[PDB]
């Protein structure tokens, strides 16, 4: 019945725990924000956007990915697989765009906290978050319309994105979506950290929070992306174990961010203590 060998259970039994902990922590963060007035700041809007993206990548893709791992097939509804892809790619890129927006906001604030003050109303933070989410949801077009744009799954042993066999698009979208946000974020973070070390202490807790979030990303997703852009050329080169572990390393990052917040802010630990 497309089962898995009894030696593949002792890891799914903990993947389910990771799935439940991701949605038990992100939901806790979200309820913390909507239960206390002190947490309706500007950067907490970006934190909420990140927590929502992690809730989606912990509640929609985690159980579907676990079921796909346990049952090595996806003859389980073509539109359902399309929805899983459209809620995996969009969530994973929305997390990295929300982090990018937060990093730009903090870099503008640390630029000079006398010139970026009239562009920090919460309405504009919400507008930027909605714009980032729109750019993320733009990922629906290629997945659902590659058979319409390029005159080209038809593979029922496993459902996959329609451009998996398109090396040029894969490498180009990987380069853009990861590297350019990653490079820009690293540049902004270095520019922040220089000034923060320069002046002086809430700055050396907020800078550490942003640095830990960025470290989480650039250190838990890059094992996936280096493999993704080395596999785009090597075709006799298909180690499934490393790929399957790197994807779940990124998912562990999604789980870790809700643990990152308590250990970098006192307000979050004060509202998590009860
Ligand atoms: C059981 O076997 C399987 C086999 C396959 C799968 C799919 C796993 N899925 C996991 C998440 C992956 N996201 C992803 N790849 C990308 C390639 C180019 C551009 C963006 C890409 N993005 C989104 C992203 C964006 C920024 C970022 F910082 C991180 C990611 C896509 C793959 C699941 C189970």
UniProtKB/Swiss-Prot annotation:
The keyword Transmembrane applies. GO terms for biological process: cellular response to histamine; chemical synaptic transmission; G protein-coupled receptor signaling pathway; G protein-coupled receptor signaling pathway, coupled to cyclic nucleotide second messenger; inflammatory response; memory; phospholipase C-activating G protein-coupled receptor signaling pathway; positive regulation of vasoconstriction. Residues 71-78, 146-167, 234-239 are extracellular. Pfam families: 7tm_1. One of its GO terms (cellular component) is dendrite. Disulfide bonds join 81-159, 234-237. GO terms for molecular function: histamine receptor activity. It is a multi-pass membrane protein. G-protein-coupled receptor for histamine, a biogenic amine that functions as an immune modulator and a neurotransmitter. Through the H1 receptor, histamine mediates the contraction of smooth muscles and increases capillary permeability due to contraction of terminal venules. Also mediates neurotransmission in the central nervous system and thereby regulates circadian rhythms, emotional and locomotor activities as well as cognitive functions. Belongs to the G-protein coupled receptor 1 family. This is Histamine H1 receptor. It comes from Homo sapiens (Human). The gene is HRH1.
């Amino acid at each position: 019945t497309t089962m898995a060998s009894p030696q593949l259970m002792p890891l799914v039994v903990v993947l389910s725990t990771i799935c439940l902990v991701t949605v038990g922590l992100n939901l806790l963060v979200l309820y913390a924000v909507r239960s206390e007035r002190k947490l309706h700041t500007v950067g907490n809007l970006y934190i909420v956007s990140l927590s929502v993206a992690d809730l989606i990548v912990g509640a929609v893709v985690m159980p579907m990915n676990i079921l796909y791992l346990l049952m090595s097939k996806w003859s389980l509804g073509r539109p359902l697989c399309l929805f899983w892809l459209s809620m995996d790619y969009v969530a994973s890129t929305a997390s990295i765009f929300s982090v990018f927006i937060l990093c730009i906001d903090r870099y503008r604030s640390v630029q000079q906290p006398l010139r970026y003050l009239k562009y920090r109303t919460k309405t504009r933070a919400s507008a930027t978050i909605l714009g980032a989410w729109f750019l993320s949801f733009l990922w629906v077009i290629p997945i659902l319309g590659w058979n319409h744009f390029m005159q080209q799954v038809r593979r029922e042993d496993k459902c996959e994105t329609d451009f998996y066999d398109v090396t040029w698009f894969k490498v180009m979208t990987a380069i853009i979506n990861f590297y350019l946000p990653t490079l820009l974020m690293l540049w902004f973070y270095a520019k922040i950290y220089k000034a923060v070390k320069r002046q002086l202490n809430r700055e050396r807790k907020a800078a550490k929070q942003l640095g830990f979030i960025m470290a989480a990303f650039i250190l838990c997703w890059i094992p996936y992306f280096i493999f993704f852009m080395v596999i785009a050329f090597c075709k006799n080169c298909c180690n499934e174990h490393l790929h399957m572990f790197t994807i779940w390393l990124g998912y562990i990052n999604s789980t870790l961010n809700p643990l990152i917040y308590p250990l970098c802010n006192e307000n979050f630990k004060k509202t998590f203590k009860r």
